[PDB]
């Protein structure tokens with residue numbers, strides 16, 4: 001498949017990183033970074049990486065594709081996956097997670113701890129070395145750099161809106177707020193960024209076509225993140241790799257937004273009493289409540305209603321952008337369970 | 339002047355807002371204004387100033403305009419923001435309580451570990467500022483690369499510093515390790531970065547000049563950080579703004595390296611029992627020892643010997659690099675007590 005052609009290049013990227021920086025003079029560190037990247041890139045569906053590649057392939061004229069440019073698309077893809085490793089390494093710190101992708105969270109390991117913040121800084125550094133190494137003499141260098149940087153700003157905005165903190169006043173848990181959280185923290189780097197890289201590599205220029213792409217990208221990313229929210233509560237931990245914590249940490253997830261939309265007055269009491277606590281009596285009661293408000297069934301309807309809506313918006317796009325591309329991206333996620 | 343450097347800060351903060359997606363999320367735009375104002379306030383502004391001085395003294399005098407000076411101040415403020423990012427992450431890892439006379443950001447009650455996200459914000463800001471003022475100049479890509487290289491070098495240094503002895507084994511507390519730690523964790527971004535920024539702004543691009551600058555900059559940084567280590571122990575918290583933690587955190591600081599050169603066989607046993615403990619009497623026993631071994635006296639001599647040595651080198655530089663500039667920079671930190 002396409003996944004095995006993408007995982008092939010990992011050791012080569014690991015090597016590019018070392019050889020193209022001051023890590024060569026300090027191999028104690030160049031070896032520590034190899035262990036960090038291998039652990040924090042392992043497991044995982046590699047979806048953002050693939051998306052970048054698939055996008056290049058689907059968008060470039062097949063006669064202009066070279067083996068060189070395919071390698072570059074895999075490299076860009078891997079930058080995005082490093083980005084992802086960086087973000088979830090910090091995210092697990094802010095969310096007091098204990099596992100991810102089947103194993104303990106990087107910071108949980110005993111030899112690491114809060115030293116993880118610096119491992120993240122190493123990872124995020126790597127990306128610009130790789131970019132610099134391949135791309136310094138090409139006209140698109142600036143655009144690539146700018147894009148990875150925007151994607152950090154957006155992701156940081158989102159993360160702030162999410163982790164921003166009164167006990168039992170759940171009146172910021174609105175749909176207006178959830179839509180902003182999920183635009184900035186997930187949509188931009190998960191879909192806008194891969195596709196936009198695919199577009200740059202394919203030398204697509206039109207600022208009107210970028211906009212049309214952004215609009216569709218962000219719709220899909222909201223979709224994606226509503227599924228993630230569902231999975232936190234209802235996913236199977238062996239399949240998903242992670243223990244679900246949105247309830248205990250009192251996050252504004254889609255499920256809580258929807259619970260509040262549906263609650264009677266007494267149920268709202270139950271919710272503002274038991275949501276956000278780590279006691280397991282309290283977490284069971286909140287899942288019993290999600291069960292009565294019939295949210296697993298709403299989810300199913302909404303997954304399908306958005307699915308149809310996206311497919312329809314995808315078929316509305318100019319062909320220079322490839323409807324097929326978006327259709328497939330949507331199918332990759334539709335009905336997923338991890 | 340410093341107060342003429344501080345006069346430009348409101349137009350920077352302003353450029354960070356208007357120039358990004360923050361124009362759409364005024365909640366987050368404001369939060370970032372608080373993060374920047376709190377974490378840029380207090381402190382010597384020295385790396386910012388070094389940027390300005392380096393430009394003004396490497397440039398040919400009649401090219402210096404009301405505009406290029408604003409540009410040099412803009413670049414200084416980018417370095418100051420970088421400083422803010424690094425101290426904010428260092429303070430988490432080092433377990434500090436206060437910086438610049440006030441609580442460390444992560445210590446503030448509402449922030450906690452979500453400080454890692456604010457650091458990402460601050461880091462992303464740097465590049466909106468660069469884009470706004472340099473997008474359409476030939477030095478843009480270099481400016482961007484400098485910043486990203488500076489993150490790498492610093493993180494490498496931070497890695498060698500946070501990587502934890504294995505009980506009472508101080509066999510790694512050597513000067514070879516100390517040298518490696520300080521060259522990477524401090525010298526690159528404290529002196530090598532600002533001076534290089536001034537060089538870029540004054541079209542100096544001979545890479546034998548960039549090399550000679552760099553060899554002098556790393557020596558000055560080594561020195562600067564030795565003073566830092568002395569201050570952790572012996573500085574006045576009201577002059578300095580921060581509490582000392584090197585002893586408690588069992589840091590490879592210049593003082594421990596030197597104490598291990600001087601310990602007798604029984605004193606090495608006192609030092610190994612008590613170094614690296616939060617117990618107030620253990621911390622006192624190590625300072626009692628630092629006094630027995632006469633380290634304050636050692637410092638004073640060494641500070642001066644190293645000072646002489648740096649001055650010899652500054653005078654050995656070629657005219658286009660301005661020995662005056664380096665001489666100036668040295669005199670600005672020689673005998674500093676915060």
Ligand SMILES: C[n+]1ccccc1CC(P(=O)(O)O)P(=O)(O)O
Nearest residue numbers: 087088091095155185186228232
């Ligand atoms: C969705 N997301 C976006 C940016 C960074 C990290 C994540 C992780 C997810 P996850 O922890 O469920 O994998 P979130 O904690 O729900 O937000």
Ligand SMILES: C[n+]1ccccc1CC(P(=O)(O)O)P(=O)(O)O
Nearest residue numbers: 424425428432492523524566570
């Ligand atoms: C020296 N240094 C370099 C990079 C970032 C932060 C610092 C902070 C100092 P400081 O915490 O004493 O101000 P260090 O922890 O002793 O190394």
Ligand SMILES: C=C(C)CCOP(=O)(O)OP(=O)(O)O
Nearest residue numbers: 044045046047101186228338
């Ligand atoms: C944005 C989110 C939900 C973070 C995890 O994304 P994935 O669930 O794609 O994580 P991996 O497949 O890369 O583990």
Ligand SMILES: C=C(C)CCOP(=O)(O)OP(=O)(O)O
Nearest residue numbers: 380381382383421438524566
């Ligand atoms: C590299 C170190 C020692 C970090 C603190 O640097 P300064 O001593 O320059 O602190 P501020 O002037 O920015 O407060």
Ligand SMILES: [Mg+2]
Nearest residue numbers: 091094095162
């Ligand atoms: Mg989260």
Ligand SMILES: [Mg+2]
Nearest residue numbers: 091092095097
């Ligand atoms: Mg999480």
Ligand SMILES: [Mg+2]
Nearest residue numbers: 228229232246
């Ligand atoms: Mg989640």
Ligand SMILES: [Mg+2]
Nearest residue numbers: 428431432499
């Ligand atoms: Mg430190």
Ligand SMILES: [Mg+2]
Nearest residue numbers: 428429432434
């Ligand atoms: Mg410190």
Ligand SMILES: [Mg+2]
Nearest residue numbers: 566567570584
């Ligand atoms: Mg110190």
